[PDB]
Design a protein around this ligand. Structure first.
Ligand SMILES: OC[C@H]1O[C@@H](O[C@H]2[C@H](O)[C@@H](O)[C@H](O[C@H]3[C@H](O)[C@@H](O)[C@H](O[C@H]4[C@H](O)[C@@H](O)[C@H](O[C@H]5[C@H](O)[C@@H](O)[C@H](O)O[C@@H]5CO)O[C@@H]4CO)O[C@@H]3CO)O[C@@H]2CO)[C@H](O)[C@@H](O)[C@@H]1O
Length: 180
């Protein structure tokens, strides 16, 4: 995509959970299940505002625990998240360190979703005792997502991806160049 970002409607991903998603990189939070996506897919860098992932909805499915490879299940539910946030390369090498020159993380995954705990998504997705998984994602219509968007936190905030056709397409737009 523009800027060299890798933005695909379906693929393989890793998954973690995080706390504190009330002031996210897209500039609007949301009351439903939300996630951060790795920088190479988000379409922006820290401090540059919203990227083209903002507001898009994805169905997430876990099918493997990389820390316990003998575990065969059960896994959690498939959930639909809205992307509101950025998982930056800096400080998150293991999971969100994908760059244009090495577009997979330490678990071999080209994408990463960090699911926000605050609003309930991680309790539906992660089985107790297994807080990091790999699996798949697929972009869906936000008709499949429940919740409501919060107010704009700063000028330029954007969740317009929530009404966009699936990638490839442009809604909020990408900013800057993808990390090398
Ligand atoms: O940077 C991205 C994002 O990270 C979030 O934090 C992540 C963190 O990055 C992950 O490293 C961390 O992963 C831990 C898993 O949640 C947790 O489930 C897993 O637990 C292992 C455990 O370590 C292991 O000892 C245990 O082994 C047992 C076997 O399963 C059994 O078969 C055997 O009989 O007995 C052994 C030992 O008793 O397995 C479990 C489960 O597999 O450990 C992982 C490594 O610590 O997850 C974090 C949360 O998602 C961070 O919150 C975000 O802010 C950040 O953006």
């Amino acid at each position: 995509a523009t800027g060299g970002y890798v933005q695909q409607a379906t693929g393989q991903a890793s998954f973690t959970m995080y706390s504190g998603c009330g002031s996210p990189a897209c500039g609007k939070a949301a009351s439903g299940f939300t996630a951060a996506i790795n920088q190479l897919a988000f379409g922006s860098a820290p401090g540059l505002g919203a990227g083209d992932a903002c507001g898009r909805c994805f169905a997430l499915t876990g099918n493997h625990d990389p820390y316990s490879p003998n575990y065969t299940g059960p896994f959690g539910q498939t959930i639909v998240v809205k992307v509101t946030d950025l998982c930056p390369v800096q400080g998150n090498q293991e999971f969100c360190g994908q760059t244009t020159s090495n577009p997979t993380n330490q678990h071999g995954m080209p994408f990463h979703f960090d699911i926000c705990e605050d609003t309930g998504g991680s309790a539906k997705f992660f089985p107790s005792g297994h807080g990091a998984l790999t699996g798949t994602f697929t972009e869906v219509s936000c008709s499949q997502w429940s919740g409501s968007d919060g107010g704009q936190l700063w000028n330029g905030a954007c969740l317009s991806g929530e009404t966009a056709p699936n990638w490839p397409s442009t809604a909020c737009g990408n900013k800057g160049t993808a990390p090398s």
